Write an enzyme that holds these catalytic residues in place. Structure first.
Site, mmCIF file in Angstrom:
data_model
loop_
_atom_site.group_PDB
_atom_site.id
_atom_site.type_symbol
_atom_site.label_atom_id
_atom_site.label_comp_id
_atom_site.label_asym_id
_atom_site.label_seq_id
_atom_site.Cartn_x
_atom_site.Cartn_y
_atom_site.Cartn_z
ATOM 1 N N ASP A 963 77.102 28.911 58.569
ATOM 2 C CA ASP A 963 76.176 29.309 59.221
ATOM 3 C C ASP A 963 74.847 27.751 60.008
ATOM 4 O O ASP A 963 74.379 27.892 60.672
ATOM 5 C CB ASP A 963 75.724 30.425 58.774
ATOM 6 C CG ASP A 963 74.931 30.038 57.531
ATOM 7 O OD1 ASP A 963 74.589 29.452 56.988
ATOM 8 O OD2 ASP A 963 73.927 31.242 56.893
ATOM 9 N N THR A 964 74.867 27.011 59.016
ATOM 10 C CA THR A 964 74.523 26.197 59.504
ATOM 11 C C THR A 964 74.752 25.057 60.225
ATOM 12 O O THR A 964 74.012 23.942 60.297
ATOM 13 C CB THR A 964 73.291 25.634 58.332
ATOM 14 O OG1 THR A 964 74.251 24.854 57.320
ATOM 15 C CG2 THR A 964 72.629 26.565 57.039
#
Ligand SMILES: CCCCCCCCCCCCCCCCCC(=O)OC[C@H](COP(=O)([O-])OCC[N+](C)(C)C)OC(=O)CCCCCCCCCCCCCCCCC
Ligand SMILES: CCCCCCCCCCCCCCCCCC(=O)OC[C@H](COP(=O)([O-])OCC[N+](C)(C)C)OC(=O)CCCCCCCCCCCCCCCCC
Ligand SMILES: CCCCCCCCCCCCCCCCCC(=O)OC[C@H](COP(=O)([O-])OCC[N+](C)(C)C)OC(=O)CCCCCCCCCCCCCCCCC
Ligand SMILES: CCCCCCCCCCCCCCCCCC(=O)OC[C@H](COP(=O)([O-])OCC[N+](C)(C)C)OC(=O)CCCCCCCCCCCCCCCCC
Lengths: 1033, 51
Positions: A963-964
C-alpha cells in the site's frame, strides 16, 4: 501446423555498397549476433564496413559467413541500407542479380521509386519498407528516420565546429570575458531537439523555434528560448507532419527570423514539408542579415533547403557567411549509424515474424489503428510483385483523442477552491468564539481559586506539550511512546497520598490505593528499561564514548538538597513539582536531536525520582507505614524490571498496550479510593460537587482505556482473530452506551447517599468497559496503530483528571504532556494515510477523497526475473534505494538486508533506505528494527525527503510492501486508496519486487519497467545474500 | 577510445609517451592527438605536418 519455413533454411545477405559516398552499414557484428541468434543464416560480402571501421573478421566471428557478391544478394534475404540501383561494379541493375523470391527491407521510398518498384515487380520479390514505418508507439523500437535525424543532428552540431572561429561555451576567466554564442535551431522535429541537446551540452545559448506547438514545448523543455511570431494562426500539421498556415504567419515568422538573424551567429535549418520541397525560411537579404563569420547549415540538403542560397554538397563561403551545405552529414558517422541501423532492423524483425525456426510474416489488411498488423501491411509494400504501396487508412482510432486523466491533487485543489473567502474567516471566528465561551463556562463553575490555578497551569503545560513533540526527529518516535508510558506511572503519586494506616491496610480504600501503586510501579521500571535498551541500539560504533554515569551529580544534589531541606524544617514540594514537571518536559524535548537522546532519558529518571521523593516526603509517614510503600513499589519495580529484558524489540506493541491497560486500571482504582475516603467530608466543601464530577469523568476515561487496551493487546498478539468482527446493531448500541455515560451523571448529584453514590459510581466502569470492547473489537488490524495511540491520549487525560482531583500540579503537567503527545502521534499517522479519525473509529469505507464508485482496473504485462538476473542488474548500480516493509522485518529477515548493505557500501555504491510512516504496527517501529539489524542511521531516510531523490537513482529494491508503493493513489480518483501520500518509486528505472506469487492489484506490478522476482522474502533475501558474498569474493 | 598527447618539456625534446605497437593496440578507428607537434611529439610515429 505452422506454415513458417525453418529459419536455418532462411539466409540473410549483406552486400557491398554501390552508391557513391555510401559509408554507413546495415548490419554490424553486434548486428550479426542477433537474427542468427534468432535463426536466419548470414552470408557476408568482402567489403562492407571498412569505411565504417568494422573489419570482416569481426562479422566472421560474430556468426556471418564470408561469401561472394552475386551469391550474397541472391539469398533468401537480401539486406541493404538503400534501394537496389544500376550496380556499375557489376554493370547491371542490382535487382537483376538477386534471387526470384527474395526478402527486401531497405530504404525504398516507392512514391519516389516507381521505376524501382517496376524493377522489383519484374523480379517478383517481397519488399518490406523501412521508410514507410509509421509513427507508432509499438514501432518505437524501429524508427529509422528518427535515429538518422538524431545522428545527423549530432554530426551537424559537430560540423558547427571547424567552421566557427570562436569558442562555443565561453568562460569569464582573468584574461577577458568570452561571450557565449547564439545558435538558431530553425525547424524543430527530432533533429532539432537532438542538435539542441548537443548545443546545450556544448554550452551555447540556443533559441530554436518551430511552427508546431509541441515543438515549442519540447524546445523549452530542452531549455531553448522559444521564439514567437505575432500572427498566431492555427498550428497546422495534424497527424505527425507539418502543413501550411496562412501567409500572415509566414510573413510574421519571416520578420521574426530576420530580426533574430541579426542576433544569432549559428543557423541550423531542419524543417521539411512531408512529401514536398523545403519551405523557404531564409531569403537572400534574410540570410545576409547575419553578422560576418556566421555559418548556415541546412539539414534538409536533399530536398533543397530553407535557405534561398544553398549549394548541395559543398562548403561554399559566399561572401563571408559560409553556407555549410554538404549533403551526407550522417553518412560520415558510419559507426553509430550502422549500430542504430542494426538496432532498428533487430527491433523490426523481432516483431516481423516471432517464431523460432519459423517465418511467415502474414500481414493483415484490415487496417486497425495501433495494430502491428496494419503497421506490417504499411511496411510490406511489395509481395512478389503485388504492390501494397497505396495503403488504406486505419479503421480504429488508436492514439488520436486527448482523454488524459486529471490527478487527485486537482480534485483537492477544487475542494479547496469551492470555499469562498467568507467561509474561511467565518469558520475560524466561530471556532474562536466557541473556545472563548468555553473558557467563560469553565470560569462560571469554578468553586475556588485552586481550580483556577490548576486550569491555568494545565493550559500552559498543554501548549508546552503541543509545541515540544512536534520537535522530535521522526526516527525517534518509537522511544517516545515508551518514554510517555514510563512517565505515565506517576499515578503512584495518586496512590501514595491515599495509602495509609499501617504496614497492612486498615480500611478498604487504603487497600485499593495499595493495589494502584503496586500496579503502577510496573510502568515506571519497565518503561525506562525499554527506553534505554532502545536508545542503545541507535548508537553508531564510530562515535566518541558517551559517559552517562555523571548524571548522578544533578540527580544526587537534587534529591540530596530536597532531603536536607526536609531535615532543615523547610518545605519545597510545590517547587519540587515544578522541578519534576520541567524535567519531564525536558525528557521529551531533549530527544529531538538524535545526538542528545541519552539526556532525554536521564531527565525523565530525575523527574520521576524527584516527584516520588517529594510526594513521599510531603505527608510525614511513620517509620512502619513507609515499609509497605517501599515494599509495594519495589515489588512492582521487580516485576517490570524482569519482564522488560526478556522480550525482543519486534514484540514491543504488546508491551506498550499492556502498560496502557495498567495506567487505566490504576486511574480507576485511585478514583474510587479517593471517593470512598472523602465521603464524610461532603458538608464543608465548596469544591465537593466539582471533585465528584471529576471522579466520574476519570472513572469513565480509565475504564475505556483499560478495556480497549487489553482488547488491543489481544488483537495484536494473535489471541483474537485479526478480522474486524461485526455486531448487527452497533451504532444504536454505541450511542446508547455513550448516552448512558452521559445520563448517569444526572442522578449522581441530588442524592448524597453513599449506598446510591458508590453503586452508581461503580456502574460506570462497567459501561466504559463494554463500550471499549465494542469500539475496539470492530476496527481491523491493517489500520491498527491509530488505536494504539488514541489509548495513549486516553491515559494522559486520565492523569489530567487525576490531577484535578488530588490538587497536584505534577500530575496535571505530565498529564497534558502525555495527552498532547498521544494526539499528535495519532494525527501524524492519520495524515500519513489520508483517512480521518472518525472514519477509522466508528467504521468507514475508503479514504476521504474517494467518491462515487467503480474502482478502475489497470491492465499491463508481467516481467519475471530469477536470482541471477537480479544480481546481474544489481551489480552495476551506484545509487540504490531500498524501501523495506513490515513483512520484511517481522519475518525475521532483516539481518541479510543488514549485511547486504554492509557488503555493498564498501564497494563504492550508495545504499539508502526509504521509510514510510505506516510501515509497521507502532509509529516508528521500522527505524528501530533496522537499527536492531545493525544499520547506521545516516542511511535511513523518511518519506518527505527521499521522495524527490528518486529520479537520479539507478536501482530500487522494493521488499514486501503493497500500500505504500501503489500508483493508484496519485492518478486514479476512483480508487480505494486514493490521495494517500506514497513513495514515488516509478521514476526510477529498475524495480525489484519480492513477494510470494501474484496479485485491487498494484499497477506497479504490471508497469513494464518493473523487474520482479518470486519466493518467500527470507528465502529470496538470504539466497541473494549468499550470491552477493560468493560473487565478489 | 580517444587519446590526446600534450606532454612536452620546455627547452628540450618532448618524450615519446606512445610506442610503435601500443599505438596500434587500440581499436580500428582510434584517435591519437599529438599536441606537442612543434616540439616533436609524444608518440613513436608522428609526422608533424599532416593528418
Ligand atoms: C531545570 C532543568 C530543566 C531541563 C529541561 C528544560 C527544557 O524544557 O528544555 C527544553 C528546551 C530546549 O529544547 P530545544 O529548543 O533545544 O529543542 C529544539 C526544539 N525545536 C526544534 C522544536 C525548537 O529548553 C527551553 O525551552 C528552555 C527555556 C527556559 C526554561 C528554564 C526553566 C524554566 C523557567 C525558570 C523557572 C524558575 C525561574
Ligand atoms: C535515588 C534516585 C536516583 C535518581 C537518578 C537515577 C539515575 C538517573 C540516570 C543516570 C544516567 C544513566 O542512565 O546512566 C546510564 C547508566 C549506565 O548505563 P549504560 O549507558 O552504560 O548502558 C548499560 C545498560 N544496562 C544498565 C541495561 C546494562 O545506567 C544507570 O546508571 C542505571 C541504569 C538506568 C536505569 C534503568 C532502570 C530504571 C529504574 C527506575 C529509575 C528510577 C525511577 C524512580
Ligand atoms: C482542542 C484544540 C486542539 C488544538 C487546535 C488545533 C491545532 O492546533 O491544529 C494544528 C495541528 C495541525 O498541524 P499543522 O499542519 O498546523 O502544523 C504542521 C507543523 N509542521 C509543518 C511543523 C509539521 O493540529 C493537530 O496536529 C491536531 C492535534 C493537535 C494536538 C491535540 C491537542 C493538544 C492540546 C490539548 C489542549 C487542551 C489541554
Ligand atoms: C483534540 C482536538 C483535535 C482537533 C484536530 C483538528 C485538526 C485539523 O485541523 O484537521 C484537519 C484535517 C483536514 O485534512 P487536511 O489533509 O486537509 O489537512 C489540512 C491541515 N490544516 C488544517 C493544518 C490546514 O483533518 C484530518 O486530516 C483528519 C484527522 C483530524 C483529526 C486527527 C486526530 C486529532 C486528535 C484526536 C485525539 C483522540 C481523541 C482524544 C479524546 C480525549 C477525551 C478525554
Amino acid at each position: 501446423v505452422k506454415p513458417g519455413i525453418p529459419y536455418k533454411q532462411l539466409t540473410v545477405g549483406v552486400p557491398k555498397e554501390i552508391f557513391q559516398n555510401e559509408k554507413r552499414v546495415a548490419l554490424s557484428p553486434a548486428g550479426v549476433q542477433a537474427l542468427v541468434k534468432q535463426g536466419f543464416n548470414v552470408v557476408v560480402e568482402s567489403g562492407a564496413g571498412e569505411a565504417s571501421k568494422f573489419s570482416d573478421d569481426h562479422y566472421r566471428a560474430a556468426g556471418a559467413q564470408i561469401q561472394g557478391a552475386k551469391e550474397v544478394l541472391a539469398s533468401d534475404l537480401v539486406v541493404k541500407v538503400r534501394a537496389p540501383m544500376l550496380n556499375p561494379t557489376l554493370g547491371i541493375h542490382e535487382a537483376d542479380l538477386l534471387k526470384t523470391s527474395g526478402t527486401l527491407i531497405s530504404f525504398i521510398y516507392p512514391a519516389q521509386n516507381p521505376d524501382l518498384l517496376n524493377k522489383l515487380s519484374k523480379r517478383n520479390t517481397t519488399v518490406l519498407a523501412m521508410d514507410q514505418v509509421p509513427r507508432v508507439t509499438i514501432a518505437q523500437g524501429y524508427d529509422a528516420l528518427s535515429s538518422m535525424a538524431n545522428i545527423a543532428g549530432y554530426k551537424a552540431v559537430v560540423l558547427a565546429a571547424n567552421h566557427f572561429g570562436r569558442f562555443f561555451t565561453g568562460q569569464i576567466t582573468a584574461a577577458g570575458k568570452v561571450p557565449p554564442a547564439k545558435i538558431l535551431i530553425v525547424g524543430g522535429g527530432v533533429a532539432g531537439l537532438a542538435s539542441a541537446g548537443a548545443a546545450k551540452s556544448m554550452g551555447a545559448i540556443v533559441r530554436g523555434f518551430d511552427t508546431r506547438a509541441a515543438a515549442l514545448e519540447q524546445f523549452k523543455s530542452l531549455g531553448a528560448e522559444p521564439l514567437e511570431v505575432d500572427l498566431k494562426e492555427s498550428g497546422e500539421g495534424q497527424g505527425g507532419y507539418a502543413k501550411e498556415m496562412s501567409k500572415e504567419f509566414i510573413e510574421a515568422e519571416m520578420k521574426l527570423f530576420a530580426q533574430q538573424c541579426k542576433e544569432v551567429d549559428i543557423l541550423i535549418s531542419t524543417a521539411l514539408i512531408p512529401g514536398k520541397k523545403a519551405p523557404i525560411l531564409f531569403n537572400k537579404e534574410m540570410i545576409e542579415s547575419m553578422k560576418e563569420g556566421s555559418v548556415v547549415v541546412d539539414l534538409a540538403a536533399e530536398a533543397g533547403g530553407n535557405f534561398e542560397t544553398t549549394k548541395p554538397g559543398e562548403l561554399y563561403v559566399h561572401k563571408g557567411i559560409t553556407h555549410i551545405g554538404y549533403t551526407d552529414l550522417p553518412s560520415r558517422m558510419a559507426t553509430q549509424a550502422s549500430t542504430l541501423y542494426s538496432n532498428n532492423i533487430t527491433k523490426l524483425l523481432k516483431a516481423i515474424s516471432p517464431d523460432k525456426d519459423n517465418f511467415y510474416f502474414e500481414v493483415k489488411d484490415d487496417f486497425d489503428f495501433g495494430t502491428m498488423g496494419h503497421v506490417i501491411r504499411g511496411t510490406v509494400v511489395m509481395k512478389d510483385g503485388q504492390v501494397i504501396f497505396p495503403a488504406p487508412t486505419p479503421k480504429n482510432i488508436p492514439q488520436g483523442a486527448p482523454v488524459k486523466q486529471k490527478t487527485v491533487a486537482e480534485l483537492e485543489a477544487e475542494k479547496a477552491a469551492t470555499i469562498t473567502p467568507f467561509r474561511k474567516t467565518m469558520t475560524s471566528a466561530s471556532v474562536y468564539t466557541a473556545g472563548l465561551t468555553g473558557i467563560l463556562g469553565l470560569g462560571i463553575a469554578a468553586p475556588n481559586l485552586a481550580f483556577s490555578q490548576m486550569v491555568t497551569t494545565f493550559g500552559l503545560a498543554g501548549i508546552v506539550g503541543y509545541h515540544t513533540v512536534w520537535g522530535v526527529t521522526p526516527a525517534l518516535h518509537s522511544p517516545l511512546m515508551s518514554v510517555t508510558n514510563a512517565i505515565s506511572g506517576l499515578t503512584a503519586v495518586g496512590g501514595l497520598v491515599l495509602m495509609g494506616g499501617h504496614l497492612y491496610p486498615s480500611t478498604t480504600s487504603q487497600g485499593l490505593a495499595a493495589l494502584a501503586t503496586f500496579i503502577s510501579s510496573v510502568n515506571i521500571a519497565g518503561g525506562f528499561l525499554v527506553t534505554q535498551r532502545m536508545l542503545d541500539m541507535f548508537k553508531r560504533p564510530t562515535d566518541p564514548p558517551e559517559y552517562n554515569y555523571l548524571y548522578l551529580l544533578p540527580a544526587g544534589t537534587f534529591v540530596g538538597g530536597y532531603l536536607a531541606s526536609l531535615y532543615s524544617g523547610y518545605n519545597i514540594e510545590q517547587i519540587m513539582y515544578l522541578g519534576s514537571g520541567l524535567c519531564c518536559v525536558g525528557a521529551l524535548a531533549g530527544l529531538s536531536t538524535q545526538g542528545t537522546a541519552r539526556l532525554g532519558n536521564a531527565l525523565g529518571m530525575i523527574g520521576v525520582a524527584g516527584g516520588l521523593a517529594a510526594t513521599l516526603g510531603g505527608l510525614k509517614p511513620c517509620p512502619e507505614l513507609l515499609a509497605q510503600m517501599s515494599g509495594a513499589m519495589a515489588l512492582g519495580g521487580t516485576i517490570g524490571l524482569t519482564i522488560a529484558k526478556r522480550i525482543q524489540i519486534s514484540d514491543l506493541p504488546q508491551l506498550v498496550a499492556a502498560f496502557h491497560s495498567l495506567v487505566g486500571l490504576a486511574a480507576v482504582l485511585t478514583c474510587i479510593a479517593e471517593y470512598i475516603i472523602e465521603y464524610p467530608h461532603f458538608a464543608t466543601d465548596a469544591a465537593a460537587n466539582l471533585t465528584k464530577i471529576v471522579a466520574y469523568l476519570g472513572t469513565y476515561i480509565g475504564g475505556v482505556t483499560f478495556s480497549g487496551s487489553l482488547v488491543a493487546y489481544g488483537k495484536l498478539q494473535g489471541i483474537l482473530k485479526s478480522a474486524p468482527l461485526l455486531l448487527p446493531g452497533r451504532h444504536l448500541l454505541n450511542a446508547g452506551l455513550l448516552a448512558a455515560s452521559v445520563g448517569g451523571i444526572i442522578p449522581f448529584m441530588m442524592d448524597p447517599s453513599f449506598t446510591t453514590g458508590i453503586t452508581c459510581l461503580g456502574s460506570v466502569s462497567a459501561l466504559s468497559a463494554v463500550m471499549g470492547v465494542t469500539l475496539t473489537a470492530a476496527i481491523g488490524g491493517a489500520d491498527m496503530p491509530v488505536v494504539i495511540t488514541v489509548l495513549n491520549s486516553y491515559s494522559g487525560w486520565a492523569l489530567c483528571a487525576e490531577g484535578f482531583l488530588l490538587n497536584n500540579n505534577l500530575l496535571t503537567i505530565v498529564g497534558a504532556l502525555i495527552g498532547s503527545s498521544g494526539a499528535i502521534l495519532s494525527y501524524i499517522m492519520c495524515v500519513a494515510m489520508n483517512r480521518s479519525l472518525a472514519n477509522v473509529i466508528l467504521g468507514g469505507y475508503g479514504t476521504t477523497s474517494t467518491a462515487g464508485g467503480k474502482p478502475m482496473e489497470i491492465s499491463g504485462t508481467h516481467t519475471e526475473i530469477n536470482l541471477d538476473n537480479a544480481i546481474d542488474m544489481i551489480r552495476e548500480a551506484n545509487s540504490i534505494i531500498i524501501t523495506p516493509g513490515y513483512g520484511l522485518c517481522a519475518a525475521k529477515a532483516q539481518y541479510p538486508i543488514a549485511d547486504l548493505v554492509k557488503m555493498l557500501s564498501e564497494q563504492g555504491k550508495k545504499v539508502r533506505f526509504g521509510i514510510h510512516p505506516v510501515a509497521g504496527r507502532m509509529p516508528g517501529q521500522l527505524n528501530v528494527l533496522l537499527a536492531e539489524a545493525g544499520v547506521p542511521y545516516d542511511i535511513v531516510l523518511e518519506m518527505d525527503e527521499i521522495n524527490h531523490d528518486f529520479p537520479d537513482t539507478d536501482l530500487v529494491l522494493v521488499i514486501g510492501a503493497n500500500d505504500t508503493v501503489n500508483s493508484a493513489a496519485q492518478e486514479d480518483p476512483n480508487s480505494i486508496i486514493a490521495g494517500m501520500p506514497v513513495l514515488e518509486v516509478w521514476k526510477s528505472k529498475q524495480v525489484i519486487v519480492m513477494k510470494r506469487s501474484l496479485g485491487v492489484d498494484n499497477p506497479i506490478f504490471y508497469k513494464p519497467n518493473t523487474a520482479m522476482l518470486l519466493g518467500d522474502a527470507k528465502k529470496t533475501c538470504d539466497a541473494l545474500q549468499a550470491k552477493v558474498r560468493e560473487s565478489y569474493q
